[PDB]
Amino acid sequence: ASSESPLTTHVLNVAMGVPASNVTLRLYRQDPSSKTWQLLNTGITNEDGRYPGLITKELFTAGVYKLHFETAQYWASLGDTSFYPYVEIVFTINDPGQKYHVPLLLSRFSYSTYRGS
Amino acid sequence: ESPLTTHVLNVAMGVPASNVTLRLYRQDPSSKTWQLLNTGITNEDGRYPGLITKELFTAGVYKLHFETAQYWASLGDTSFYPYVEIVFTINDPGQKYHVPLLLSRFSYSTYRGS
Amino acid sequence: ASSESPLTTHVLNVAMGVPASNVTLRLYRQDPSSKTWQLLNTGITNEDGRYPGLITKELFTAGVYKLHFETAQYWASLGDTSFYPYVEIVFTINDPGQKYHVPLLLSRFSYSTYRGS
Amino acid sequence: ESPLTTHVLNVAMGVPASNVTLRLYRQDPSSKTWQLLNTGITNEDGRYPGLITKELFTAGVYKLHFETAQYWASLGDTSFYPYVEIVFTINDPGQKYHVPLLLSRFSYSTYRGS
Numbered sequence: 022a023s024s025e026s027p028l029t030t031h032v033l034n035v036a037m038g039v040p041a042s043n044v045t046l047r048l049y050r051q052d053p054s055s056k057t058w059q060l061l062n063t064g065i066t067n068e069d070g071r072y073p074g075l076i077t078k079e080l081f082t083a084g085v086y087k088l089h090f091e092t093a094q095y096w097a098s099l100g101d102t103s104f105y106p107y108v109e110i111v112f113t114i115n116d117p118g119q120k121y122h123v124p125l126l127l128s129r130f131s132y133s134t135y136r137g138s
Numbered sequence: 139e140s141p142l143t144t145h146v147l148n149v150a151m152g153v154p155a156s157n158v159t160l161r162l163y164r165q166d167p168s169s170k171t172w173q174l175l176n177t178g179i180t181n182e183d184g185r186y187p188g189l190i191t192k193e194l195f196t197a198g199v200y201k202l203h204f205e206t207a208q209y210w211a212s213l214g215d216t217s218f219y220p221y222v223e224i225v226f227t228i229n230d231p232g233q234k235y236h237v238p239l240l241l242s243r244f245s246y247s248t249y250r251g252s
Numbered sequence: 253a254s255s256e257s258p259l260t261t262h263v264l265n266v267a268m269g270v271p272a273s274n275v276t277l278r279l280y281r282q283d284p285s286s287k288t289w290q291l292l293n294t295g296i297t298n299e300d301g302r303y304p305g306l307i308t309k310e311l312f313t314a315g316v317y318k319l320h321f322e323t324a325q326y327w328a329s330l331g332d333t334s335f336y337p338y339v340e341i342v343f344t345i346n347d348p349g350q351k352y353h354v355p356l357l358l359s360r361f362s363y364s365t366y367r368g369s
Numbered sequence: 370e371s372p373l374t375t376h377v378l379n380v381a382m383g384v385p386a387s388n389v390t391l392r393l394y395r396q397d398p399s400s401k402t403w404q405l406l407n408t409g410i411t412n413e414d415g416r417y418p419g420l421i422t423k424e425l426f427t428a429g430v431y432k433l434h435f436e437t438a439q440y441w442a443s444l445g446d447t448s449f450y451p452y453v454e455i456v457f458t459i460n461d462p463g464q465k466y467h468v469p470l471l472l473s474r475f476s477y478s479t480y481r482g483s
Contacts, residue, residue: 031482031483033480033482033483035242035244035245035480035481036150036242036243036244037243038218038243038244038245038480038481039483040483069483070483085337093344103344104152104344104367105341105342105344106316106342106343106344107342108342109340110336111336111337111338111339111340112335112336112337113324113334113335113336113337126245126478126480128149128242128245129150129151129152130149130150130151130366130367131149131150131152131240131242131364131365131366131367132365132366133247133357133362133363133364133365133478134362134363134364135362135363135378135380135383135471136335136362136380136383137378138384138385138414138415147366147368149366149367152366152367154369183369184369199451218458218481219455219456219457219458220430220456221456222456223454223456225450225451225452225454226449226450226451227438227449227450227451240366242480244480244481245479245480245481246478246479246480247357247364247476247477247478247479248476248477248478249264249266249269249357249473249475249477250266250269250449250475250476251262251264252262252264252270252271252301266381266473266475266476267473267474267475268474268475269449269474269475269476335383357476359380359473359476360381360382360383361381361382361383362380362381362383362471362473364478
């Protein structure tokens with residue numbers, strides 16, 4: 022197969038039509054018993070708005086995951102205010118045998134996400 | 139009071155998209171061309187009251203056409219889409235249909251609202 | 253003026269083209285010093301997917317707010333699985349003199365939001 | 370290797386939209402009509418490799434047309450949009466352009482991707 026992470030993301034700046042590079046992100050998984058969030062990885066998006074290596078196949082077990090993006094810091098770095106201090110996407114992985122692509126389409130006053138591929 | 143309504147939002151700036159030229163058409167089943175029904179410009183809230191009278195809202199396929207690149211040019215910007223058309227089926231002349239359009243320079247989205 | 257709440261929402265089930273009624277939601281505001289979240293209101297969306305009275309004008313002061321929607325419970329009530337256990341939208345109110353409309357467009361495998369009007 | 374790519378996702382079900390008929394046009398500047406360039410059907414990943422050769426990717430206005438209602442009918446469903454057209458400006462024949470389309474029965478979204 023491929024050595025790419027089974028969970029991937031892609032942040033697009035839809036206001037300017039370019040990848041959102043330099044966005045700080047963090048990945049967590051919830052403890053099903055305590056409901057607390059365990060930090061698994063942190064990163065900054067690359068020039069194509071992606072973050073290779075978000076998680077390894079070994080650690081991508083079934084559970085509830087959270088991706089957290091520092092959206093206001095991204096817009097501030099471009100000199101702009103924005104509506105959302107950060108964006109969190111919380112999602113259920115029942116079958117860790119699949120690939121999951123979790124993109125984020127961003128403007129200063131809107132965002133959207135989907136289970137892409 | 140029009141059964142068909144719209145609402146255009148500038149989601150890059152978080153404001154209604156005012157002063158957007160729009161045109162409404164119905165597909166002509168004979169000629170297989172688009173029959174123009176109305177033209178106007180969105181108001182300060184990005185809406186256009188009075189798009190069509192209930193008496194003319196027959197079942198069929200309709201098209202809303204929005205002059206999106208002209209809008210962004212009026213704000214001093216370029217953009218990816220010369221215009222945006224939404225083609226949709228009205229099968230119940232007795233229901234209300236709301237057709238929002240969310241715009242940025244490099245994306246757009248639409249849905250049946252309420 | 254109007255006696256409507258200055259903050260409003262509208263949840264649309266875009267898979268079926270109808271308002272998402274019966275969705276449990278909760279509104280919080282963050283303490284700027286402790287960073288903790290204070291619960292301000294809870295509600296269930298109505299037949300039009302809205303929740304009148306989310307907050308009063310008196311209590312809608314400047315700050316960081318969070319709307320939390322019980323999305324998986326909504327889909328489960330329709331007999332469907334879905335990707336997101338819940339959705340949170342975190343947003344900055346610097347000028348509480350404005351109206352803020354914070355809609356949520358929902359399907360089982362996608363959602364989007366914007367600062368509407 | 371086509372400089373123009375697409376990707377159609379069924380966001381209601383969280384899967385690629387396979388078997389969607391699409392057509393690519395370029396606006397004809399003389400006749401002011403749409404010139405058909407290519408037709409095909411999305412693959413199992415919702416993509417269509419080979420939409421246009423670089424030699425034919427000249428600057429201009431292009432249209433991608435997707436047979437959305439036929440797709441939902443193939444899944445046993447009705448839907449609001451007979452088809453979806455995305456009309457976009459290519460001003461740099463040397464760049465790559467990716468044009469995703471996100472579909473549900475009652476919404477759609479598009480953006481310039483990467």
